[PDB]
């Protein structure tokens, strides 16, 4: 790494401890090794040429060179740091890595990010991207019906397809709060950490207690977008009405897709509790769920090209 910024991944989810345990040294709760997943995906990057790459349907994709390496070349010639990692390419290559990614996305994906940034900066020393490349894993094995999803896929990358209904206005949310001491004008940035800020409560310079006030419009904000979407399931049981699902997009995917657009959506299925009343801080046993979004596939084999 040269020193390019590590901008946080709002769409993947809030951070966690990343607790590791020996049975070599897997992540707690998961059958994942950071080293194993990282190395397997580095192999996948460096040596995965297609068995077939129809140039007509996949313009810019050859059958000779390793697949994603020329993608890194184009991500060097232009400045957008995003790499389209086809989950079915991963399925053909390494079924184990498919299982680990589409069971443990928010932790396998940062390792994939680390590997991609490492390989890219090894290849191109003087190339300058605004921040680290990010891997967009999509085309996971299509779940047909949200109403036939189970409570076992929470935080587990799924895919469905359907038409948007609304794309509401942006909503900033905090990522790095700004504090200033009311007395001595001492500043400090406080990173948002695992879902909640840490109000400093003591000036670092003059030690006054709770003189630290939160300056709003000096902070850091990533964006958001509620995107109410109507599912087009391929499985329609006998009386399941048209299911509709909320999509929260974030800094890079917001306002990339308008109402009425028809999209496959691959994203993190995310349960979040429901507050009992808008002001009381209790919650409900009966959670809601909403798909996040890690990727929209615009292309459809049945429809024609979009605008």
């Amino acid at each position: 790494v040269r020193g390019t910024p590590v901008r946080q991944r709002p769409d993947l989810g809030s951070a966690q401890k990343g607790l590791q345990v020996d049975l070599k040294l897997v992540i707690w709760g998961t059958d994942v090794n950071v080293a194993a997943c990282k190395e397997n995906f580095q192999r996948f990057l460096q040596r995965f040429i297609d068995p077939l790459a129809k140039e007509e349907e996949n313009v810019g994709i050859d059958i000779t060179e390793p697949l994603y390496m020329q993608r890194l070349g184009e991500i060097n010639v232009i400045g957008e740091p995003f790499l389209n990692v086809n989950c079915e390419h991963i399925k053909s290559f390494d079924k184990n890595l498919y299982r680990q990614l589409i069971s443990y996305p928010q932790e396998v994906i940062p390792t994939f990010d680390m590997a991609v940034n490492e390989i890219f900066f090894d290849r191109y020393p003087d190339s300058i991207l605004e921040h680290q490349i990010q891997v967009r894993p999509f085309n996971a094995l299509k779940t047909k019906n949200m109403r036939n999803l189970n409570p076992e896929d929470i935080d587990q990358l799924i895919t469905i397809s359907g038409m948007v209904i609304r794309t509401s206005q942006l909503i900033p949310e905090m990522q790095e709060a700004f504090f200033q001491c009311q007395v001595c004008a001492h500043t400090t940035r406080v990173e948002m950490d695992r879902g909640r800020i840490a109000e400093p409560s003591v000036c670092g310079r003059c030690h006054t207690t709770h003189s630290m006030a939160l300056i709003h419009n000096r902070s850091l904000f990533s964006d958001k977008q509620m995107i109410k979407l109507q599912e087009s399931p391929e499985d329609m049981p006998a009386g399941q009405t048209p299911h509709t699902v909320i999509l929260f997009a974030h800094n890079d995917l917001v306002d990339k897709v308008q109402p009425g657009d028809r999209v496959n959506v691959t994203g993190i299925y995310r349960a979040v509790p429901i507050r009992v009343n808008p002001r009381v801080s209790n919650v409900k046993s009966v959670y809601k769920t909403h798909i996040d979004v890690i990727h929209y596939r615009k292309t459809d084999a049945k429809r024609l090209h979009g605008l």
Binding site: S201, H207, T209, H210
Partner: protein, 272 residues
Amino acid sequence: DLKGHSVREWVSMAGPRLEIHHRFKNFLRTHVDSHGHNVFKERISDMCKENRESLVVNYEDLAAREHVLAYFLPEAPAELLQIFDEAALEVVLAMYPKYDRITNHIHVRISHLPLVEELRSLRQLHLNQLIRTSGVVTSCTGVLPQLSMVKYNCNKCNFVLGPFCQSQNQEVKPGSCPECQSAGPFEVNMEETIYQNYQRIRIQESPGKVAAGRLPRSKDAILLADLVDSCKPGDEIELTGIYHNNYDGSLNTANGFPVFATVILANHVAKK
């Protein structure tokens, strides 16, 4: 300079605070000696050699070289003493910046105050003034620990309410906890507090100085943090201190004239 306002309010103003602090620093550095030695250098050298925590200066030298401070001294002694604490701290840190761990404080004592009052005659006209006096210690309790920068556990949430300075007048009382916002039953954190030695003596007029038909009169006195156990019972002692009335001593109770006790915050004890 002088104006219509009182001496105490004057020295409370920030402008003359900087003025007289600068003057004290100036003569601390520059009043060389009677015979060109820079005695303050050697006195500070010995002071930090022992870590005495307390310097003493001669009032004759003080007044002679710089007389405005000397005139101000008995009028509003408390403020002048606090500033000279700060200025002496500045100069000792300048000479030995390593002193920072050593007590974070230096007291200053004033010797040879010219006008000695007698314990028979200490009237209303000496309240809140630094006087010099003589006597014999009739009693001297043991050294007790006093709060000086006290921290309180808010025992609703165990936040450490910060270090409050403790004046001698009224016991410090926190308003509320900055965290849970309660005026709760706070209680002192025994450890983070930094206490201070407190000893209580009682001097009385010597029979060699009492008159014909009389009973010798006795004044209390408080020694703090360096002068404790600097005098035992029966010692003929000169005492210099702020004759003092406004702490909590007053006969506001029933069956009593509105009559106030008094003490002497001793600023220098000298055996003889």
